[PDB]
Design a protein around this ligand. Structure first.
Ligand SMILES: O=C(NCC1c2ccccc2Oc2ccccc21)[C@H]1CCCNC1
Ligand SMILES: *[C@@H]1O[C@H](CO)[C@@H](O)[C@H](O)[C@H]1NC(C)=O
Length: 335
């Protein structure tokens, strides 16, 4: 008897406004892992006890301590923006919030030091669609929908601003937390099912629509730390903001930061505005200091890209709901 009224929540940890991670349990008894819940990918993976370099810094899964483990052994390679991971498939019981699902995940044996020694999380829970899943492995949310236990076939994200004994964030499975948003949701449908990507009708700097006038794509990526666009777009945008290209990021003089113009994204006939307080890492106010912007360039290869990606920078401002039943994304202002 699976009566659909569940709304299981996961408390997230905010690390530097770049990494938001919660706790999952794998096995019988459960082995806990710090995971990033990523709408940009669809595979679940944790480091393996069978791991031979970043592995030393993370919690490892030992199949030999799980009574519910079922072998598979299929080799698997998962490629992200900063680096690639490698391992094999295994099956066990995964606990997320108060939900228990039999999930096929990847035990990772090859995990490079760069970028994984910078990661504060052990693994990744992909919140994308089977269409994006490596080796056509059923994603965890698809398996939760199959249980027929949720209030609604939706999940929502809340990413807070770094503070202190405060909530870093929160994923709700089955609904949305009204304590974390103001007013009502505005929905935008997905271009196609299979990707958490919507149409964008322009990017503005101040009150002038500078970019994406003839339309472009926007990927709603909980796994991305920043807002990203193509090199072309980010060059135009940063020139408008008067930001200079440093080696890995764009900076402005720290004094110039509070006077930077609003950046607006046109999504579903509504403008979603980020003020300077939302995209500048205001670490100092000095003229002698350089301050980083929470916006970078990233070229996403086809079929997904070229696209913009609305990461933690966007999500922190706008509470996000991902609707599987209706294939649409909802934004309400975060609280
Ligand atoms: O690579 C991504 N995000 C970066 C973020 C990350 C998210 C998911 C998987 C691996 C991963 O690597 C690191 C390592 C250190 C710090 C942050 C990250 C994107 C790639 C496309 C799908 N979403 C996540
Ligand atoms: C591993 O899992 C796949 C499903 O992705 C299945 O088709 C395959 O037969 C399994 N292989 C083994 C060795 O159990």
């Amino acid at each position: 008897l699976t009566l659909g009224n569940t709304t299981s929540s996961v408390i997230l940890t905010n690390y530097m406004d770049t990494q938001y991670y919660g706790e999952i349990g794998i096995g019988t008894p459960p082995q806990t892992f710090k995971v990033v819940f990523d709408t940009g990918s669809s595979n679940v993976w944790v480091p393996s006890s069978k791991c031979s370099t970043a592995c030393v810094y993370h919690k490892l899964f030992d199949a030999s301590d799980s009574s519910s483990y079922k072998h598979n052994g299929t080799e698997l390679t998962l490629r992200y923006s900063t680096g690639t991971v490698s391992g094999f498939l295994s099956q066990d019981i995964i606990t997320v919030g108060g939900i228990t699902v039999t999930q096929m995940f990847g035990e990772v044996t090859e995990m490079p030091a760069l970028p994984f020694m910078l990661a504060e999380f052990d693994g990744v829970v992909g919140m994308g669609f089977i269409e994006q899943a490596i080796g056509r492995v059923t994603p965890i949310f698809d398996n939760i929908i199959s249980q027929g236990v949720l209030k609604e076939d939706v999940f929502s994200f809340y990413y807070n601003r770094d503070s202190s004994q405060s909530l870093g964030g929160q994923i709700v499975l089955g609904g949305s937390d009204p304590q974390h948003y103001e007013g009502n949701f505005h929905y935008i449908n997905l271009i196609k099912t299979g990707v958490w990507q919507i149409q964008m009708k322009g990017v503005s700097v101040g009150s002038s629509t500078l970019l994406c006038e003839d339309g472009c794509l926007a990927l709603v990526d909980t796994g991305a730390s920043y807002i990203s666009g193509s090199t072309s777009s980010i060059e135009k945008l940063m020139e408008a903001l008067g930001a200079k290209k440093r080696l890995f990021d764009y900076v402005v003089k720290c004094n110039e930061g509070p006077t930077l113009p609003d950046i607006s994204f046109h999504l579903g006939g509504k403008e979603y505005t980020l003020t300077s307080a939302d995209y500048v890492f205001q670490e100092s106010y000095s003229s002698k200091k350089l301050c980083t912007l929470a916006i970078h360039a990233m070229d996403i290869p086809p079929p997904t890209g070229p696209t913009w990606a609305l990461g933690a920078t966007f999500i922190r401002k706008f509470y996000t709901e991902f609707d599987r039943r209706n294939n649409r994304i909802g934004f309400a202002l975060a609280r």
